[PDB]
DNA sequence: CCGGAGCGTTCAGCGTTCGTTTATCTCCCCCTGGCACTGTCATCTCCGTCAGACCGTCGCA
């Protein structure tokens, strides 16, 4: 399932590359740890392969992902509750869910809201974080350059 | 030898321009009200005064 040198998407950190497989022993049990890293925060993540699906790791989605996130990005008739508190409570939950379709919907609706009137400066931090993690997810999926990854999305979100 | 013209000063007709106000239209400040998974007891003080008194307080006798 998991090999060396491959790219894996980790929640709240985006795409990452695996360095090696670690065989550290805990209580006399040889767990199959794997170590991975990103270029954003300069951190190393060690996850055993047995509970990898439980913690929420996920591989690189092929050609079946960009088309579905584009068609849910272009999906009209999206509505939000009138009170901003319910939508505010929903969006970070959708971000923490880690689904690509959910984060694409959140960034599309939020970008539309910022375009129409302009929300605030506080929400700019989370829009920026979501755009960063989404462009990092799509950058290593299509194997494109990061500047090309952020450039290609500029003509499709309108 | 006054008479007229030109000149100096001073006022009444209407004709425009100021001095000081007024309500309406943007931009901002400031106060009260809403948020709905649950989330139901903190906090470190204080020591090597100090010197003895003044005083009430308090349990034992």
Give an account of the 3D structure.
This is part of a larger assembly, with one chain. This protein is an alpha+beta fold. Helix content is 45%, strand content 17%. The protein is built from six helices and six strands, in the order E-E-E-E-E-E-H-H-H-H-H-H. It has helices spanning 52-55, 63-73, 84-97, 100-116, 122-139, 146-152, and strands spanning 7-10, 14-22, 25-26, 29-30, 33-37, 44-48. The strands form two sheets. The protein has a four-stranded antiparallel β-sheet with strand order 1-2-5-6. A two-stranded antiparallel ribbon has the order 3-4. A hairpin with a 2-residue loop joins strand 3 (25-26) and strand 4. Helix 4 packs across helix 5 (122-139). The longest helix is centred in the C-terminal third of the chain and has 18 residues, at 122-139. The radius of gyration is 18 Å and the shape is elongated. The protein binds one DNA strand of 61 nucleotides through helix 3. Residues 1-111 form the CarD-like/TRCF RNAP-interacting domain. One of its GO terms (biological process) is rRNA transcription. Pfam families: CarD_C, CarD_TRCF_RID.
Measured as a percent range, the helix fraction is 40-55%
Largest β sheet strand count, sense and barrel closure? 4 strands, antiparallel
Global geometry: elongated
Side by side, the strands of the main sheet go: 1-2-5-6
Order of helices and strands: EEEEEEHHHHHH
N-C termini distance:
38 Å
CA radius of gyration is: 18 Å
Provide the structure class: alpha+beta
Number of helical segments? 6
* Overall strand count: 6
Strand content bin: 15-25%
Family: Belongs to the CarD family.
Protein name: RNA polymerase-binding transcription factor CarD
Pfam family, one: CarD_C
Domain CarD-like/TRCF RNAP-interacting: 1-111
